[PDB]
Amino acid sequence: KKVELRPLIGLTRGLPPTDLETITIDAIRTHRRLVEKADELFQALPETYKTGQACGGPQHIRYIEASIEMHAQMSALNTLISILGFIPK
Amino acid sequence: KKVELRPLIGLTRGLPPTDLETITIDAIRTHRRLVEKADELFQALPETYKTGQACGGPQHIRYIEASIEMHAQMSALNTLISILGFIPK
């Protein structure tokens, strides 16, 4: 993985191995939850929205917000994995 | 602002102006909340942790996680502002 959110290096500098592992493990769990949520909302979108032919509206907004949170958190998770050097169990 | 989270461009492509404005406005509110939370936890850290001389432990972990969420969401907000071309009221 690559460092996508650089400020995380300074934040976790010198953190004990077990502590960084704990943070990363929880971030993996969070990622799974965010992916599941975004996926659930994507599946319920009309075909026209899934293909990008239609845009806008409350339902679409909710999916986008869920996807935004997923992508943002994923950048953090990838960064944590990059710092750790491996994907903890 | 600059595009820090590229997937957001595809997600918001063609979104009606009012809809993108709504999403960005809520992201601004979210950012304020996350900054306040991270700040509150930073202030309560012992001086040794604020200066980086000490690292690790439950309290530090909680601050780091709050800061991580803040930074991640901020990358999303900056990206939304970059796409919109301005900071909505």
From Swiss-Prot, chains A, B:
Q: Which InterPro entries would you find in this protein's record?
A: Tscrpt_rep_TraM (IPR015309), Tscrpt_rep_TraM_sf (IPR036336)
> Sorted alphabetically, which keywords does the UniProt record give?
Conjugation, Plasmid, Repressor, Transcription, Transcription regulation
What GO biological process term is on the record, naming one?
A: negative regulation of DNA-templated transcription
Among Gene3D superfamilies, the record links this protein to: HR1 repeat
Describe its function.
Negatively regulates conjugation and the expression of tra genes by antagonizing TraR/AAI-dependent activation. TraM may either bind or modify TraR or AAI making them unavailable. Alternatively, TraM may bind tra promoters preventing TraR activation.
UniProt name for this protein: Transcriptional repressor TraM
Per the UniProt record, the source organism is: Rhizobium radiobacter
